[PDB]
Ligand binder design. Sequence first.
Ligand SMILES: [K+]
Ligand SMILES: [K+]
Ligand SMILES: [K+]
Ligand SMILES: [K+]
Ligand SMILES: [K+]
Ligand SMILES: [K+]
Ligand SMILES: [K+]
Ligand SMILES: [K+]
Ligand SMILES: [K+]
Ligand SMILES: [K+]
Ligand SMILES: [K+]
Ligand SMILES: [K+]
Ligand SMILES: [K+]
Ligand SMILES: [K+]
Ligand SMILES: [K+]
Ligand SMILES: [K+]
Ligand SMILES: [K+]
Ligand SMILES: [K+]
Ligand SMILES: [K+]
Ligand SMILES: [K+]
Ligand SMILES: [K+]
Ligand SMILES: [K+]
Ligand SMILES: [K+]
Ligand SMILES: [K+]
Ligand SMILES: [K+]
Ligand SMILES: [K+]
Ligand SMILES: [Mg+2]
Ligand SMILES: [Mg+2]
Ligand SMILES: [Mg+2]
Ligand SMILES: [Mg+2]
Ligand SMILES: [Mg+2]
Ligand SMILES: [Mg+2]
Ligand SMILES: [Mg+2]
Ligand SMILES: [Mg+2]
Ligand SMILES: [Mg+2]
Ligand SMILES: [Mg+2]
Ligand SMILES: [Mg+2]
Ligand SMILES: [Mg+2]
Ligand SMILES: [Mg+2]
Lengths: 378, 51, 65, 92, 139
Amino acid sequence: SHRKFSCCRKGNLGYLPRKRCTRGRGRCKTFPPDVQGAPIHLTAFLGYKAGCTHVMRFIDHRGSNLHNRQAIDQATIIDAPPMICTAIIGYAKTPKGLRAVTTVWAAHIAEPAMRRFYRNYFHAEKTAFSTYMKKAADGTYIKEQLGRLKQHADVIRIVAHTQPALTPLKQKKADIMEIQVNGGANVAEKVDYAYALMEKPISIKDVFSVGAQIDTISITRGRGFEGVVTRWGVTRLPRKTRRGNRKVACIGAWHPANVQYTVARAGQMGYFHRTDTNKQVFMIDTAENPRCCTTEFDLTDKSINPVGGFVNYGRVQGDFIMIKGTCPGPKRRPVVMRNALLPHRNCPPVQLQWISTASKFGHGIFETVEERRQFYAK
Amino acid sequence: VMEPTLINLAREYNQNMMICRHCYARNPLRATNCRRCRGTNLRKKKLSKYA
Amino acid sequence: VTTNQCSYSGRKILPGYGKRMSRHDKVLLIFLNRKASVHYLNKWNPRKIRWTLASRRARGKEVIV
Amino acid sequence: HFPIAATVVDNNKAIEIRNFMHQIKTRRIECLPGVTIAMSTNVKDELILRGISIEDVSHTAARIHESLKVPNKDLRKFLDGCYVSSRGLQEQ
Amino acid sequence: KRGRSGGIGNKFRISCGLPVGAVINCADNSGAKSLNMIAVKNWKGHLNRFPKASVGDMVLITVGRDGKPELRRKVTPAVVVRQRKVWRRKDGVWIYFQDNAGVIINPKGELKGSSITGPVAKEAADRWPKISTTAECVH
RNA sequence: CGGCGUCGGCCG
RNA sequence: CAACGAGGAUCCCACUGUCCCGAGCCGCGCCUCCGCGAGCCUCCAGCCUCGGGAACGGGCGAGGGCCGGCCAGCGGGGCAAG
RNA sequence: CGGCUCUUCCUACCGUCCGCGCGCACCGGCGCGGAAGCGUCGGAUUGUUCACCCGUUCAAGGGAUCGUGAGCUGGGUUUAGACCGUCGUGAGACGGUUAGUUUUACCCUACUGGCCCCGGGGCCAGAGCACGGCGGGCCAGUACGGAGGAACGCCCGCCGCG
RNA sequence: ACCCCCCCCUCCGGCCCCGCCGCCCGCGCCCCAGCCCCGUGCCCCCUGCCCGAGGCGGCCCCCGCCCGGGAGGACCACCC
Ligand SMILES: [K+]
Ligand SMILES: [K+]
Ligand SMILES: [K+]
Ligand SMILES: [K+]
Ligand SMILES: [K+]
Ligand SMILES: [K+]
Ligand SMILES: [K+]
Ligand SMILES: [K+]
Ligand SMILES: [K+]
Ligand SMILES: [K+]
Ligand SMILES: [K+]
Ligand SMILES: [K+]
Ligand SMILES: [K+]
Ligand SMILES: [K+]
Ligand SMILES: [K+]
Ligand SMILES: [K+]
Ligand SMILES: [K+]
Ligand SMILES: [K+]
Ligand SMILES: [K+]
Ligand SMILES: [K+]
Ligand SMILES: [K+]
Ligand SMILES: [K+]
Ligand SMILES: [K+]
Ligand SMILES: [K+]
Ligand SMILES: [K+]
Ligand SMILES: [K+]
Ligand SMILES: [Mg+2]
Ligand SMILES: [Mg+2]
Ligand SMILES: [Mg+2]
Ligand SMILES: [Mg+2]
Ligand SMILES: [Mg+2]
Ligand SMILES: [Mg+2]
Ligand SMILES: [Mg+2]
Ligand SMILES: [Mg+2]
Ligand SMILES: [Mg+2]
Ligand SMILES: [Mg+2]
Ligand SMILES: [Mg+2]
Ligand SMILES: [Mg+2]
Ligand SMILES: [Mg+2]
């Protein structure tokens, strides 16, 4: 018989299977589309999730009920030390998709990159790029090998790695990622730009800008094995059910005589690969600047690290970026950031009047250590 | 106000045609069968109260 | 920045913290945290709670202008 | 009661239409290549399409007629639009 | 002409503290003592979900046995002006009241009383101009 | 029960 | 018909996780390991769709899938067992 | 038996989408073709399916062993106690009424996750799939026609879902 | 055209490029029209039956754990 009252299904079938992610980190699967003629620019960066705070900003909208008023917004903080570009890869568009031409590495490779090639570093015998460094010593080989990417490739990407000795993390090996070069006048102009970045650092202020939108890619918090009420959000059965009320009662009709893939079942919850889109950039600064988080509205000097320190992260030493809202993962997961594929259209500008630097360990009420000391001055 | 000659010009697009009693398809004047269903049962389009 | 003073204790409240309560004699009260709000609702006397502004004023430890 | 406005653009390769029945949407119709469109310089409220290809000239005039549609009304009473009046050759 | 529905402008979403079955206090001087809330306007529901309202919403009520005899046995429109469930505004302020209250007011926006006792919220004063003019306090 | 789909007939 | 009832009913006050709509926590089982160590049941086997057929097939005709070996769970089917 | 829970399917389409017709001025109704994506709800009395009223964003009809009890519940019906009315010489019979134990998975398949050690970065065959609906401002008390009373477009919110 | 298909998005056998560093196998390229069909209505027809370079296309092979922490977790696995 027909189900008597109308009600939708529970949960989204386009995020199946609910298995643990097997990719290692967030992997950028698409890049923004290249526009022939546009100025050259980079499209991606890799950071680590540091914390959350909230800000006061002056809203300049039109037709909105907050048109000339003040709003308090939640912002997330991402730690972004400079990345080092170590290799150039090219690909060709073929009747079988993207196929690569060759990958040209740099002459000299750093310790953080070399450690990613080994399981244990102290014990291993070190024979990565042993022949390559000898041949590539004279720079002529690179020029010849770049003489192919200019002649056969349609898409150019750079290989770049992070420097984990400038963070509070525990790992010592880098995270390696391809970054696509968009824009330019022809292919041959994008290889002169990639060569001029070889073995050099890249700052996040030279990819993203303030007020633009980005996409954040990461792996979500894990909860392990979990039943249907929490994993899927189905209704809890009444109190006098004999064997427990945290279940789906009927898991299929008699025919077909199988269990369907559309029925809610228990299993792994969390630790999934996800993409949250259209995040607006609030501020790009550095933690060495002691005036990075000071508006006029306060007169003291305030910087990014809070009183007490970033709970469960550590101390931020260099560059960071600030996005509105929230992003997947716990503190310290690596987050990939790209330009927005289909950005939201009617977003107002960014005009910050105040940022919270009070302690997040507990309920802190002092912006700075100096004025807590003045408060308890004996 | 629309001058009478523009009315006649517009009336050969909004009026002056045949409807098919079975499927309500527009058909040309002096047409025997319906263009869509192929039946022979066709009336005129009714006149407006200002026509 | 613009700030408020807790009505139960004397502390300052920063933008985006605590909660307000509208009493029925048309008087507003601004609370720093939930602890301060529970003390007020139970009718615990501010002068007997030793960390408040009111207590330290009554104990000579706080200078009254 | 609502005068239609019409500006030839793109050096007679497109036309814009404004203010059809007092509406905010504007209309842009490009000519199929080889066709030119001029405002009448003789008798007011009248457009002129010219070209060598008869399919191309008629396909452009029909694409203009199809761009000015009155929605959800008795069309026997609301009769605004752009209508083909003369289908002939040129006269030099 | 003369249409003029009820509720001036747009409203942001806030926490709804009162579901169907709640009994709230009467804040004007019509004669009613308590109002029993039986429905919410503009409510599209979902299976098993109770309808619910916040301050500023128009609700349907019945006047209870402690109220005046003439007002009883009828489905009357009203507006909630105070609630106990705490809610967050856009500027980051969290605020709540001591009790739950409403006034009797028709969808054209004209009140059935001459006064309102105690403070009212800004949510109800912005949507309903008549409430903003006879209120003695707005928080 | 309808068919200016196509090919073939009969009666004027 | 006063009094009385682990008797059958309707309503109100008070009370509440019965419910809107669920969330967090404690102990013990489960789970992994050392020692010990059974019952029930079993034509043969164990992936589907249609047809025909003792008129609802795992096997028969035709099509679509599929290394092999295991665990924690689960109740659609085995017209499951008793 | 129903209900609760949960999933999938049909179109003989009720609202929303696109076209035509009217005894279509506007508004609002009505008739037809294509269309199964989303929506079709909260309560009072009844075991009820059904029905009947109140309310709301105003509320189509069906299938899957009359889908679904080793998923539940056990109100109904449906053993053994007991009462009433009619019937029977009688033991007893039949319209109402009250009290009445809901057993077992560790096997096989299906399904949900997990495993059988093998560098770094990528590409893509196959399979999965997700943005609908309701308002407000301007247009405008304007087109239309006295009373009344629209629309394309842009912008701002809400509800349901994720 | 709320429909249908693709993108975005989730999984992903296999494969490719790059690091450390050998084997084998095959021998054959005009294009475009059919109511111009441009002079056609053929060739091949011996993969051993006596065939066995270079270039041009293929094929194979090539990479540890235990141990302890964790943002991960039934056991395993995963990230360090
Ligand atoms: K059913
Ligand atoms: K059902
Ligand atoms: K359930
Ligand atoms: K089933
Ligand atoms: K399933
Ligand atoms: K389910
Ligand atoms: K389950
Ligand atoms: K995603
Ligand atoms: K409340
Ligand atoms: K025939
Ligand atoms: K007595
Ligand atoms: K008794
Ligand atoms: K007794
Ligand atoms: K008794
Ligand atoms: K729980
Ligand atoms: K049969
Ligand atoms: K059969
Ligand atoms: K059988
Ligand atoms: K069966
Ligand atoms: K429909
Ligand atoms: K009993
Ligand atoms: K929403
Ligand atoms: K919702
Ligand atoms: K939601
Ligand atoms: K589909
Ligand atoms: K999409
Ligand atoms: Mg039980
Ligand atoms: Mg039991
Ligand atoms: Mg904290
Ligand atoms: Mg229900
Ligand atoms: Mg809750
Ligand atoms: Mg069998
Ligand atoms: Mg067979
Ligand atoms: Mg079973
Ligand atoms: Mg049944
Ligand atoms: Mg069963
Ligand atoms: Mg049972
Ligand atoms: Mg009995
Ligand atoms: Mg696909």
